[PDB]
Design a protein around this ligand. Structure first.
Ligand SMILES: Nc1ncnc2c1ncn2[C@@H]1O[C@H](COP(=O)(O)OP(=O)(O)O)[C@@H](O)[C@H]1O
Ligand SMILES: Nc1ncnc2c1ncn2[C@@H]1O[C@H](COP(=O)(O)OP(=O)(O)O)[C@@H](O)[C@H]1O
Ligand SMILES: Nc1nc(Cl)nc2c1ncn2[C@H]1C[C@H](O)[C@@H](CO)O1
Ligand SMILES: Nc1nc(Cl)nc2c1ncn2[C@H]1C[C@H](O)[C@@H](CO)O1
Lengths: 228, 242
């Protein structure tokens, strides 16, 4: 629990995995808990619940959200309990968080009328329980939001070519975009987690290419980190 | 861990609650963990510290009803929750009750093992859950009783045996509306699962300590008054073997 805890956020395809695997190299002392989206595509040759979800989300959304939240808690958990353990000044970068799940993705699918009155309620009961328990270990010490405007992400979704994604509309990506602003930019979304509100947030732009601004961002961290 | 843990298994209406709620009054060292069925016919997560001052906790979905009237669609959504609320309940009673007790005993209306190996797996078996839903579910279930290891390890099982016909009847007595549609073939499918787990012991779970767990089998077919004494006597006996 000496391991500092930072979760990289921002929208679908902003540049998360990219930025963080990049920042990982800055220290023999820093590690990365990526989204286990790997699993989700071939659940164990198992089925693709992420694919499933996108196609008919009125049917599969709840089933995805709980399973998504599950796998995260579970890797985040697995990574606190080894590797780094016993190291100069350990640091752990989370591709997203249980908090992104509920209050960004989940919440949004509820508005979308894809998760109903009951599912939305079961999920939050489910999510709370799980994080009055295990998530009393994954308490965020900082958030590093990476902003990127709807239309960049829409196009980065083609740069990646994840078959289960070229169907995702702009409309979708803007909703997702609103929830990040609210929570993270303005802070105009006080959750039901008392501890969140004072926790530090460092925003970085990622709309321009890794051309002539990127390496610089790294520094916005190296210092930003040990400022506590 | 000084507290012993005893689950009460058996088909809908066999009469677990009724029985065991009577059986808890015998001793002060005995307490019972109800099965949250209430909170399944009325789904409701927790309210905001301030919201709850000016706003009630209103009536919300009855997922039990949903899981029964269109299974194909609602079972994973019922399993996930029926299992959650159960573990939460049993877990709190482990850590909140029976401190000032000599030889304490906690009874469960059903185990988390019966959720997964009877209802869920039966529902999987009559394709109301798809491979995908069934995989997910056992992933989540495996992980959870991994994350607690021994905390909820049962110390013994009381199987209450009734016939499907009896049960169907006892279903009509009790009168929960969402059960008046249940046909006989259902409780049968469910009865055989209980006989496999708890009689013939032929069923392969994922927690080995289960095979070796003592199992008391009680016939609850006959109307209550007759066999009570014998059942009460078979229980206290069984209990002083653990
Ligand atoms: N800064 C950037 N500029 C141009 N392309 C990027 C940038 N960061 C990531 N990409 C590309 O966009 C896609 C998404 O990147 P990724 O890090 O996987 O996003 P996320 O992890 O946030 O979903 C990939 O195809 C990658 O090549
Ligand atoms: N031995 C018995 N003889 C007649 N009725 C019983 C007996 N045991 C339970 N019942 C009744 O049958 C119905 C189902 O019992 P209950 O304890 O609610 O079953 P369970 O909780 O096992 O589903 C209730 O009306 C209950 O009072
Ligand atoms: N809680 C989540 N809810 C949804 Cl609907 N999707 C998620 C979630 N967490 C990660 N992803 C997925 C969506 C993108 O396709 C991919 C980008 O990282 O991750
Ligand atoms: N794990 C469970 N899966 C299903 Cl499909 N149903 C259950 C479960 N546990 C209790 N019930 C229901 C059956 C009765 O209708 C009622 C009384 O237990 O609760």
């Amino acid at each position: 629990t000496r391991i500092k805890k930072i979760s990289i956020e921002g929208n679908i395809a902003a540049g998360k995995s990219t930025f963080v695997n990049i920042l990982k190299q800055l220290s023999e002392d820093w590690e990365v808990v990526p989204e286990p989206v790997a699993r989700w595509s071939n659940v164990q040759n198992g089925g693709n619940v992420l694919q499933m979800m996108y196609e008919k989300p009125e049917r599969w959304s709840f089933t995805f959200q709980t399973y998504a939240c599950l796998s995260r808690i579970r890797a985040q958990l697995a990574s606190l309990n080894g590797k780094l353990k016993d190291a100069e000044k350990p640091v752990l970068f989370f591709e997203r968080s249980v908090y992104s799940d509920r209050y960004i993705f989940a919440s949004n699918l509820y508005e979308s009328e894809s998760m109903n009155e009951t599912e939305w309620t079961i999920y939050q009961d489910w999510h709370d329980w799980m994080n009055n328990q295990f998530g009393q270990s994954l308490e965020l010490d900082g958030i590093i939001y990476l902003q990127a405007t709807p239309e960049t992400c829409l196009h980065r979704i083609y740069l990646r070519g994840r078959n289960e994604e070229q169907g995702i509309p702009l409309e979708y990506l803007e909703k997702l975009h609103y929830k990040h602003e609210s929570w993270l930019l303005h802070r105009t979304l006080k959750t039901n987690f008392d501890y969140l509100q004072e926790v530090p947030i460092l925003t970085l732009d990622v709309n321009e290419d890794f051309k002539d601004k990127y390496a610089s961002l790294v520094e916005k961290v190296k210092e930003f980190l040990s400022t506590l």
